[PDB]
Design a binder for this molecule. Structure first.
Ligand SMILES: [Cl-]
Length: 247
């Protein structure tokens, strides 16, 4: 598998927190989490192909291709206890990565933490997520309104064109995903979702619940798709907290 990024390696750690990014996203929004983590947890950031250190690799073109790239990277980590976290599309990717690790016989995560995403079988107004081949302005508007591009980047076409090409690649991958009815994990599952995001929290909580046979907890957090700056900065506290009922 491709190399996992570890901004603060911890050979002493007992467990690994593996983080998966959103559509058009890299490892950047998670790197600050390396400052806050208990020493028994190592931060491992998955970089999807085509961005950041992997800027020179071809984009994945379909969902299972991206999933299997993630699985090949995560599988070597699974000899130690690990937690799978993902945000927005990365929440669906974390769920499918957990399900595939289970299917292939790898050890399961200690917990799966899904953030900022509706349940995958309940895939949202069509106009509120633009198509991979929609007009560029529609893609930039969506990024801006979700907080995924800064004002400084949107102010400069030359930088924006890049961010947009990356988003188009990931939107095409996400459009090819279809949830398979009956897919379920057995691990503890924590759902994080923000009061001011697109879906009502009550629906996010209700529809993720059947996707695990294990312990379940849902936490309504302040703010929108990235919560509030203070909550985002502290989000690993929700990744390392045991799910009530887990071992
Ligand atoms: Cl996304």
């Amino acid at each position: 598998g491709a190399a996992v990024q570890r901004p603060r390696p911890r050979p002493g750690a007992e467990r690994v927190l593996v983080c998966l990014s959103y559509c058009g996203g890299g490892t950047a929004p998670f790197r600050q989490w390396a400052e806050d983590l208990p020493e028994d947890v190592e931060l491992a950031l998955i970089c999807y192909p085509g961005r950041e250190a992997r800027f020179g690799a071809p984009f994945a073109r379909v969902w299972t291709e991206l999933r299997d790239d993630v699985v090949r990277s995560v599988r070597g980590l699974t000899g130690r206890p690990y937690i799978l976290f993902g945000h927005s599309m990365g929440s669906w990717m974390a769920f499918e990565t957990a399900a595939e690790l289970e299917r292939i016989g790898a050890a399961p995560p200690e917990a799966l933490v899904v953030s900022g995403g509706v349940a995958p079988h309940k895939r949202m107004p069509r106009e509120d997520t633009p198509r991979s081949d929609a007009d560029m302005d529609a893609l930039v508007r969506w990024m801006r309104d979700l907080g995924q591009v800064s004002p400084a980047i949107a102010a400069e076409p030359e930088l924006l064109k890049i961010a947009v090409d990356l988003l188009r690649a990931d939107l095409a991958v996400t459009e090819s995903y279809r949830f398979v009815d009956g897919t379920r994990v057995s691990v503890p599952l924590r759902v994080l979702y923000g009061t001011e995001d697109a879906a009502p929290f009550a629906d996010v909580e209700r529809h993720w619940r059947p996707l695990t046979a294990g312990p379940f907890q849902a936490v309504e957090l302040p703010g929108g798709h990235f919560y509030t700056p203070e909550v985002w900065a502290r989000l690993t506290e929700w990744c390392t907290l045991p799910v009530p009922g887990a071992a």
